[PDB]
Write a protein that binds this ligand. Structure first.
Ligand SMILES: Nc1nc2c(c(=O)[nH]1)N[C@@H](CNc1ccc(C(=O)N[C@@H](CCC(=O)O)C(=O)O)cc1)CN2
Ligand SMILES: [Cl-]
Ligand SMILES: [Cl-]
Ligand SMILES: [Cl-]
Ligand SMILES: [Mg+2]
Ligand SMILES: [Mg+2]
Ligand SMILES: [Mg+2]
Ligand SMILES: [Mg+2]
Length: 159
């Protein structure tokens, strides 16, 4: 099964960080550890080093040479490279989320209370097609710059 995981500012702006949220990074790690992660080449270059404890699959029509990750050229190849696993995590960026959304059955979202200047957005999804099965709000604190709300949604309908 395919899931997307993303952190969204107001207006669904995503980035590679205008905010400083170690709690969100802990949420990201907890929910991706021991699962393959699929990302586009822009996201890969922004991370710079393979995420530990996860198979790192990079979707790009023009692969790099880095032997530390697995390079694939299509959504279908990305999925095949993951093989028989319970859950595949798609970690962005904008275009990769857009291509994978139709195949996804679960969303892990962090809704951040920040207005920011970026131009890359998380895909449009029809809220009526999803059910909110978890939500938790957290205030900002000495370690986290903004307030945020974790949410998990499960797909109920497809169009
Ligand atoms: N919800 C959430 N989802 C996301 C991101 C986020 O920002 N938060 N960011 C996007 C991908 N970018 C990164 C950049 C850095 C890291 C990263 O470095 N993670 C460490 C944890 C951080 C650390 O302890 O050093 C890890 O092992 O997972 C993860 C995703 C995609 N999805
Ligand atoms: Cl957590
Ligand atoms: Cl990308
Ligand atoms: Cl505090
Ligand atoms: Mg090689
Ligand atoms: Mg889009
Ligand atoms: Mg769309
Ligand atoms: Mg319904």
């Amino acid at each position: 099964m395919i899931s997307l995981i993303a952190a969204l500012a107001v207006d669904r702006v995503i980035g590679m960080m205008p905010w400083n949220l170690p709690a969100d990074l802990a949420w990201f790690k907890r929910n991706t550890l021991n699962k393959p992660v699929i990302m586009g080449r822009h996201t890969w270059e922004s991370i710079g080093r393979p995420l530990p404890g996860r198979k790192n699959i990079i979707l790009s029509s023009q692969p790099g040479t880095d032997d530390r990750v697995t390079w694939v050229k299509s959504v279908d190849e990305a999925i095949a490279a993951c093989g028989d696993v319970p859950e595949i995590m798609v970690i962005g960026g904008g275009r990769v989320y857009e291509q994978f959304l139709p195949k996804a059955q679960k969303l892990y979202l962090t809704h951040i209370d920040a207005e920011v200047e970026g131009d890359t957005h998380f895909p449009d999804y029809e809220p009526d097609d999803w059910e909110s099965v978890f939500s938790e709000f957290h205030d900002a604190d000495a370690q986290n710059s903004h307030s945020y709300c974790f949410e998990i949604l499960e797909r109920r309908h497809h169009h």
